[PDB]
Amino acid sequence: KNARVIELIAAYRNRGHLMADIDPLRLDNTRFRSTLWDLDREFQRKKLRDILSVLRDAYCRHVGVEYTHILEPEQQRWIQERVETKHDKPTVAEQKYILSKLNAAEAFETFLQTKYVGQKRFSLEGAETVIPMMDAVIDQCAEHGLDEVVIAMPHRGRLNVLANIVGKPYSQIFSEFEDVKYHLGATGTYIQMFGDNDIEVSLTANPSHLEAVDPVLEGLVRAKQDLLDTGEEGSDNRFSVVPLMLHGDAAFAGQGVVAETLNLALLRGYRTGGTIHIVVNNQIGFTTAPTDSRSSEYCTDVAKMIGAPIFHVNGDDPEACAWVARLAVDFRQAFKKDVVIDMLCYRRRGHNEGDDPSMTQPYMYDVIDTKRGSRKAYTEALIGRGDISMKEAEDALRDYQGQLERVFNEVRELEKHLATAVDKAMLQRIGDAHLALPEGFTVHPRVRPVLEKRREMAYEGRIDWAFAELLALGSLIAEGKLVRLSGQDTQRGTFTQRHAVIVDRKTGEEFTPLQLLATNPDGTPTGGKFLVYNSALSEFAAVGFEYGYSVGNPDAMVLWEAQFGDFVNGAQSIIDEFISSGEAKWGQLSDVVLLLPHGHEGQGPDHTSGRIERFLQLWAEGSMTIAMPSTPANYFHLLRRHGKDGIQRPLIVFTPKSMLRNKAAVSDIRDFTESKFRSVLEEPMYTDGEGDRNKVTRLLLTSGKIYYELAARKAKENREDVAIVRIEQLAPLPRRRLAETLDRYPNVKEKFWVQEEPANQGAWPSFGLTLPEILPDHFTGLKRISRRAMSAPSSGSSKVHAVEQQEILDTAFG
Amino acid sequence: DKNARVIELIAAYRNRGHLMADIDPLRLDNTRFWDLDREFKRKKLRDILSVLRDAYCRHVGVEYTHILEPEQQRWIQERVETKHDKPTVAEQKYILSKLNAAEAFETFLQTKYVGQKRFSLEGAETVIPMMDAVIDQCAEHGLDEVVIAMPHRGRLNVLANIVGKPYSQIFSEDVKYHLGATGTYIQMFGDNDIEVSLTANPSHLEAVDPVLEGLVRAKQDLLDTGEEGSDNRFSVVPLMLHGDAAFAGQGVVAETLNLALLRGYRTGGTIHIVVNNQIGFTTAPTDSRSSEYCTDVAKMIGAPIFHVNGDDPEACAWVARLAVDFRQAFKKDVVIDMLCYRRRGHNEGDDPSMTQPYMYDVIDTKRGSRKAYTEALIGRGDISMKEAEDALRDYQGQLERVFNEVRELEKHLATAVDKAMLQRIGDAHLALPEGFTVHPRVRPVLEKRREMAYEGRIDWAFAELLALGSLIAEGKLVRLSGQDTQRGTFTQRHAVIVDRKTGEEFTPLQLLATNPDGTPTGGKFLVYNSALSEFAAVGFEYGYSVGNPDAMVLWEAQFGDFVNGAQSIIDEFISSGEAKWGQLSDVVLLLPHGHEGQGPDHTSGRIERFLQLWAEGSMTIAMPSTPANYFHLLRRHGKDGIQRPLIVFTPKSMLRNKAAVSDIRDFTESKFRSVLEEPMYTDGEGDRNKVTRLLLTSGKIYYELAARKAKENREDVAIVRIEQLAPLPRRRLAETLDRYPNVKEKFWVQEEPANQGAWPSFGLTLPEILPDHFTGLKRISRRAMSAPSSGSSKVHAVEQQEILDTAFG
Numbered sequence A: 001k002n003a004r005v006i007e008l009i010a011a012y013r014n015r016g017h018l019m020a021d022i023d024p025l026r027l028d029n030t031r032f033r034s035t036l037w038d039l040d041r042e043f044q045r046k047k048l049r050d051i052l053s054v055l056r057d058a059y060c061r062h063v064g065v066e067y068t069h070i071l072e073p074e075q076q077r078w079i080q081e082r083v084e085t086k087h088d089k090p091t092v093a094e095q096k097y098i099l100s101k102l103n104a105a106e107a108f109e110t111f112l113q114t115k116y117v118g119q120k121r122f123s124l125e126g127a128e129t130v131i132p133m134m135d136a137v138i139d140q141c142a143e144h145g146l147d148e149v150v151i152a153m154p155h156r157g158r159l160n161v162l163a164n165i166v167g168k169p170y171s172q173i174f175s176e177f178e179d180v181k182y183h184l185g186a187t188g189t190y191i192q193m194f195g196d197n198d199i200e201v202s203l204t205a206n207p208s209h210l211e212a213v214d215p216v217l218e219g220l221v222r223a224k225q226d227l228l229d230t231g232e233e234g235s236d237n238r239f240s241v242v243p244l245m246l247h248g249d250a251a252f253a254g255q256g257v258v259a260e261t262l263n264l265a266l267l268r269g270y271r272t273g274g275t276i277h278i279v280v281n282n283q284i285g286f287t288t289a290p291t292d293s294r295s296s297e298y299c300t301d302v303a304k305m306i307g308a309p310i311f312h313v314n315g316d317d318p319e320a321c322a323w324v325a326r327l328a329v330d331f332r333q334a335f336k337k338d339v340v341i342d343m344l345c346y347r348r349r350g351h352n353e354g355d356d357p358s359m360t361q362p363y364m365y366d367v368i369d370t371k372r373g374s375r376k377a378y379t380e381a382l383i384g385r386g387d388i389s390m391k392e393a394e395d396a397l398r399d400y401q402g403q404l405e406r407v408f409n410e411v412r413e414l415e416k417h418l419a420t421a422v423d424k425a426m427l428q429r430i431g432d433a434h435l436a437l438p439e440g441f442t443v444h445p446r447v448r449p450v451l452e453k454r455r456e457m458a459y460e461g462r463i464d465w466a467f468a469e470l471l472a473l474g475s476l477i478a479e480g481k482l483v484r485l486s487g488q489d490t491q492r493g494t495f496t497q498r499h500a501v502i503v504d505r506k507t508g509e510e511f512t513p514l515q516l517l518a519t520n521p522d523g524t525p526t527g528g529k530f531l532v533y534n535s536a537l538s539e540f541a542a543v544g545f546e547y548g549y550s551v552g553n554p555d556a557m558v559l560w561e562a563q564f565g566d567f568v569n570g571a572q573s574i575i576d577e578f579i580s581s582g583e584a585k586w587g588q589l590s591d592v593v594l595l596l597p598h599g600h601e602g603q604g605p606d607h608t609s610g611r612i613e614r615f616l617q618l619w620a621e622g623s624m625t626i627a628m629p630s631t632p633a634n635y636f637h638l639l640r641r642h643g644k645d646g647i648q649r650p651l652i653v654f655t656p657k658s659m660l661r662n663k664a665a666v667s668d669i670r671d672f673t674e675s676k677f678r679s680v681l682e683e684p685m686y687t688d689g690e691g692d693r694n695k696v697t698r699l700l701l702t703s704g705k706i707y708y709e710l711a712a713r714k715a716k717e718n719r720e721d722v723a724i725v726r727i728e729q730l731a732p733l734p735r736r737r738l739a740e741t742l743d744r745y746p747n748v749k750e751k752f753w754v755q756e757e758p759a760n761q762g763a764w765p766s767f768g769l770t771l772p773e774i775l776p777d778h779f780t781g782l783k784r785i786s787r788r789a790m791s792a793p794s795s796g797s798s799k800v801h802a803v804e805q806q807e808i809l810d811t812a813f814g
Numbered sequence B: 001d002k003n004a005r006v007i008e009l010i011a012a013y014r015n016r017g018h019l020m021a022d023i024d025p026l027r028l029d030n031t032r033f034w035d036l037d038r039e040f041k042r043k044k045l046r047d048i049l050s051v052l053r054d055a056y057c058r059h060v061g062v063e064y065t066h067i068l069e070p071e072q073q074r075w076i077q078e079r080v081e082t083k084h085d086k087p088t089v090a091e092q093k094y095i096l097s098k099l100n101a102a103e104a105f106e107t108f109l110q111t112k113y114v115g116q117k118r119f120s121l122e123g124a125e126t127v128i129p130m131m132d133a134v135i136d137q138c139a140e141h142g143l144d145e146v147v148i149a150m151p152h153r154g155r156l157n158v159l160a161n162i163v164g165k166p167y168s169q170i171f172s173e174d175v176k177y178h179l180g181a182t183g184t185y186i187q188m189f190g191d192n193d194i195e196v197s198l199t200a201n202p203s204h205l206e207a208v209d210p211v212l213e214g215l216v217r218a219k220q221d222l223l224d225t226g227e228e229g230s231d232n233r234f235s236v237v238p239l240m241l242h243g244d245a246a247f248a249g250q251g252v253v254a255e256t257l258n259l260a261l262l263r264g265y266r267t268g269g270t271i272h273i274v275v276n277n278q279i280g281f282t283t284a285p286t287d288s289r290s291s292e293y294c295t296d297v298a299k300m301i302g303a304p305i306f307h308v309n310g311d312d313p314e315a316c317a318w319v320a321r322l323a324v325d326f327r328q329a330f331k332k333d334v335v336i337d338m339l340c341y342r343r344r345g346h347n348e349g350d351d352p353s354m355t356q357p358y359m360y361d362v363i364d365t366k367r368g369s370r371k372a373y374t375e376a377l378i379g380r381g382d383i384s385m386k387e388a389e390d391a392l393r394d395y396q397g398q399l400e401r402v403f404n405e406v407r408e409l410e411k412h413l414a415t416a417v418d419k420a421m422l423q424r425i426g427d428a429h430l431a432l433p434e435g436f437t438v439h440p441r442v443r444p445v446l447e448k449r450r451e452m453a454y455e456g457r458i459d460w461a462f463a464e465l466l467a468l469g470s471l472i473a474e475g476k477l478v479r480l481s482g483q484d485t486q487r488g489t490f491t492q493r494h495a496v497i498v499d500r501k502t503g504e505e506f507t508p509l510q511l512l513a514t515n516p517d518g519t520p521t522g523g524k525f526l527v528y529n530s531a532l533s534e535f536a537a538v539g540f541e542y543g544y545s546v547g548n549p550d551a552m553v554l555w556e557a558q559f560g561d562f563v564n565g566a567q568s569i570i571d572e573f574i575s576s577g578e579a580k581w582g583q584l585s586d587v588v589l590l591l592p593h594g595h596e597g598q599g600p601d602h603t604s605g606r607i608e609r610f611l612q613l614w615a616e617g618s619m620t621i622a623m624p625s626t627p628a629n630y631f632h633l634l635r636r637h638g639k640d641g642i643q644r645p646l647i648v649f650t651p652k653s654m655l656r657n658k659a660a661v662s663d664i665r666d667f668t669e670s671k672f673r674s675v676l677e678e679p680m681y682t683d684g685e686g687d688r689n690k691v692t693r694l695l696l697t698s699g700k701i702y703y704e705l706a707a708r709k710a711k712e713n714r715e716d717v718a719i720v721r722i723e724q725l726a727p728l729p730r731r732r733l734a735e736t737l738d739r740y741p742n743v744k745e746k747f748w749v750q751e752e753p754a755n756q757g758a759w760p761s762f763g764l765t766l767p768e769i770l771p772d773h774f775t776g777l778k779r780i781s782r783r784a785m786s787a788p789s790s791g792s793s794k795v796h797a798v799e800q801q802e803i804l805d806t807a808f809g
């Protein structure tokens, strides 16, 4: 009999949530419907009736608890102890405060729908309990003495969140009203009602693309945590900046970026010490029922992927919603792990103006039409429970009216009225750092010559691309800059060229040579730091995270590296919605760098192109910098200009693969110490040699590694009649430098744009249209030499590639 | 108290025993690992404990207590917690032959050719007898086909030893590692056979996952099995292979798992095999995931997960067969996490000890699962010394055969319908089932559709249903899906209508699947509301068109602006599948497009990006301006006998523009017109010779330009529409412009920013393909923008008016 009791306790803990009264609409009519002598027997000693009452109150009332899937026994025990105890009833003051938050939320929803037209799609009606729930999250974070709560959410209830959570005044919110305000960033200060603490509250910008902002929030919070010296890269483990992420039920289950972002939660390179997730589960997605939106019992089932506790709560019970919000913050503080709150509610009205929701959901909306809002329900429950008197409920209705009056009145009143060159000692210091190994450190025999060659390059020149990148990042760290670099296998490098982190052959201990540059020769810190990580196998979440990280710390140097540029299309939503367009749409600035390994080498259509043409198509004056450098020193100056220009603009770099090891693609020490970024490059025979520019009758304009192949062919046939000009900066077009360079070749009779990429790809679709328009005296008659237009970035065969590469070389010199 | 401790101990093994199971063949985690004669209710505590250790703590880690269905938990419990019959010596020798063939293939591949290391299955050979066990168990269930999707690793090994392709066809002439293949699997110890196919894929890991599901669902619908079938067998099985780093990191995995039990997307359960070699290129699992297992995402749909030791090919084969049986019993996904290792470096330039010295010092002391299983069968006494010798002569014989075989290879149409068809589709909207209650606001839509069918003024929404309805009447399977596609985002479609009193669904176009005499046409209308996914949903529909080339398959974006969420499918499959793999798709993407002041995410389907991806006959790209031209576009696409994707930029407010309606004769006596002139010149009293300014455009801006022309009586201006954007209708465009001899200036007019819409490609292409017609072509558009439009509807309205005033200035 005592074995049956242990099985009964486990059944309530494991599956009690399936019986919990969580749906305020009670749509599922079969949810609840599908010995007595032992009830008074004792089984710590407790009677079976007392065990069953504790289990029912904890697991089968307005809170459905999912936690037995958690592999950590200490986390399961922590939830058990706090959920399976008699809870102290909230004070009348706390209850009145919860009611006053529901009064503010409904008074805001009432004014919006009444004052303006076309506001229905933004309505939080049937879900107003999310306002005292969010208030409880922020208040509990303030109680923990934390510094900031950063929110990401979709558009539903956003302005209500602006007024009743962020604390933005109505005059600012509805200043020259109308849609753009449902996507803008905001900041405020939350002051505790019953406490003496305060906390910063911010709301990040987002597109309409639901859940796309999720990794952006995490990056943004991580950047703020690194700046506050809290968390993973901090001295304290408080993670004093809390991500609060809101979601819709259909989007949370359907968008892949949710899983990608959850997968980052405990990674050393991406953890934020746990996110508080709130799903506004109104059991609908426009006209779509949950049975067409997901293959699981709950919209939050994806969170089981990382063993996050999940709390399903009845949105018509704001006390249970506030209690669960505070429990979620406490769990996050104790275990530094994500918590999901599934708030079951409803969408009172139609999705938008042209929607009578009974057309597609007659049953749900016949039930919704018999519902009285959370505010009225809570006022009626408190009255029935004897917690408040008739005068107190009447005073609360007076508070609702005064709050509705205030917003109508306040809005009425508003209606009435730089050098990048470094010294040689800097290069030598970065070279020496590669050999300044910790005591007893064992280097892998294949990594040892790379280190020794870097010391040699630092003092003797012939600096290759891989070392020039580290010279640029190392010199920024020495100057006090925080440098964050990440991507797939970025510590070692996809092409075994980087070795930013080296691994002890016997212990596996990591050593980061560039980190030595964060300390000045005298021993004082520079203020700089090198944060280098291997990312998860994600593009969408990883690019979103790095974009968010550059927003969170505008003073950081933030670089994301694609394994091959070909895989960045997995992050297209981030490129389209944030990187290329965030500045013009929201005034949100990012200095994020995308490194895209690019080049035709015969490795197939998915190991060849970063789709230059797509980034050039997205570009519009002053949105991004787009470059394809051909020399290590020009890449070094490109990165240093980007980190020191004081301008927050994304940089897109088309980086090499085989050209990393091309012996002609090396730079002299003077190119680092006495030069700057060159947007346009001429052949060294004309700038440093005995070449005669006046013999040139044919000019080849190009970008990237094909220059070396064109230069080798010119050298082989002694073609003095042909010159090769490189466009290093593809966007913005270096109009003046390009015009001044071409004027130095007066006998040119024909000009060709030469590229490896197909005719419908690379720089030709934009340069072929733009160059004759911006420089008509220089580029009227410009012709293209390239691969034929293709539906894929290249052929699948390395043999076909080699024939096509040779046809480009023969056409340019034909 | 003692009996209570036993019940708690049993639960502990069932719930968490998989944490102590000996699943890692490398044993890298060094921290990983009384009265027992009393009989409890009746068996001894020692025997109860031994059954739990063998079931949960040996070479198989079982995760199943997360499953909400008690009958599924019970089914696994009964099959795992019992004394299993040891495999016969014949089955053991057969598992060994599959380990011999797979390892020999690997040794041949790393010796004969250079640049192959990156495809090596060494350290993971056990996936070959595991896949063989899956397919053999599906054949034992009498199923029709197993369709495989997998990444690069072991692909050619899978082709020869699973698909059964000959070496002459495999090594004939990197492309081979991405092509589709088909074969017949013949049972070794059984009398059944089953079709085995391998689908094509890009290098983009996990991208093929929803494509496989779509492909399988199309095959299931054709075989009348599953969700849309008469039987519940789901006789076409998706077998999906994965890598451990990709399975945890790619969002498309979760999106595809989310489709597994949906009425519009279910395939009756997928068998998932993760080749968990505990590494991702140079990245350790602790940098790749925030969960204990790479397969933890599968708990999202309550799938059972089996973690298996890849050095134990018997446990791997047993788990594969159990997985098939679970899939058949519950029509739900099963995940097999095969723990193994990657013997060599990721590729030619990789010494894996540089980044993982500890793992590769352990890997260097490992003997293959072939040498292991051969020696373990001697240790067990299951095979003799002569048997072990002959098994080595099987290996050498297999190694010789492939060297000798490749040595020998190296030596040697009208779209118009009759008025009765239109009337039938109109009548269908009022042919309600007995006792059906129409929603009052849906009632006038059905009555207006009968009226339009007989009297004309046919709007866009009805013209679409006239095209789909007429195809169904002709015997075509029509599959239509997308976010809120049954009703339509703009409340315009009503393909499915909902009973106000019962919630019963009624599909008017489904009545056209039955001829007037009562016989079936062979056609069907499959219309669904999709999940809130773009990547998986677009991938699924692309896959569905590949699986049934005879189906009319349409995917509709809520707004064209959200299709960038499916960019990997557009780039890797739709735009390029034909040229890269010879794989054909006739998939239709419907992208609601147009500048109306709803912001940068409710305005553009990015025409410029699709036009940039296009290269000679890869896709058809269109932006129709009339309901009848859209009708003929869809009917041409469904009847042309060409498998080519169609990209359609569809309207939003133009759905209700009273000028954007068509006459019955436009459906009954016309065809698709790639180029459209103004009706005043083709049917009216307009004089083409008065025209001095020619405006070329596409889409709804035509109506605004035509309204302005009419207002000012501008006989000097003509508006020509390009309905088919790609391929450019060169001949029809040249012949149309020749009819306006007094034209002194030509303008391309568009709503979209200068760096967007059709101008970036037309501005470069039109003066090149038709120099006598388009030299001097100028652009009238919005200024170049970093976003598709402004955020303000006020700014939009000013910009729309500046375009109209510039065109008539």
Ligand SMILES: Cc1ncc(C[n+]2c([C@@H](O)CCCC(=O)O)sc(CCOP(=O)(O)OP(=O)(O)O)c2C)c(N)n1
Residues within 6 Å of the ligand: A121, A156, A208, A209, A210, A247, A248, A249, A250, A251, A252, A280, A282, A284, A285, A286, A347, A352, B483, B489, B532, B558, B562, B565
């Ligand atoms: C990636 C992505 N894919 C599609 C859309 C389109 N989309 C929406 C909007 O863009 C407006 C479109 C409708 C209109 O106004 O005409 S709402 C929505 C339904 C949301 O359901 P859920 O999460 O349950 O939340 P709620 O119940 O709280 O609304 C979807 C699909 C998008 N924005 N982002």
Ligand SMILES: Cc1ncc(C[n+]2c([C@@H](O)CCCC(=O)O)sc(CCOP(=O)(O)OP(=O)(O)O)c2C)c(N)n1
Residues within 6 Å of the ligand: A488, A537, A563, A567, A570, B118, B153, B203, B204, B205, B242, B243, B244, B245, B246, B247, B275, B277, B279, B280, B281, B342, B346, B347
């Ligand atoms: C979406 C996406 N993002 C990135 C890549 C790049 N990528 C791969 C290749 O394309 C490049 C390397 C080519 C070469 O070797 O020359 S393999 C890989 C590691 C796979 O790990 P896991 O799943 O564990 O499998 P395995 O262990 O069995 O290898 C990653 C990251 C991709 N193809 N797709």
Ligand SMILES: [Ca+2]
Residues within 6 Å of the ligand: A591, A641, A642, A643, A644, A645, A646, A647, A648, A649
């Ligand atoms: Ca900058």
Ligand SMILES: [Ca+2]
Residues within 6 Å of the ligand: B586, B636, B637, B638, B639, B640, B641, B642, B643, B644
């Ligand atoms: Ca076709």
Ligand SMILES: [Mg+2]
Residues within 6 Å of the ligand: A248, A249, A250, A280, A281, A282, A283, A284, A285, A286
């Ligand atoms: Mg919803």
Ligand SMILES: [Mg+2]
Residues within 6 Å of the ligand: B243, B244, B245, B275, B276, B277, B278, B279, B280, B281
């Ligand atoms: Mg792997």
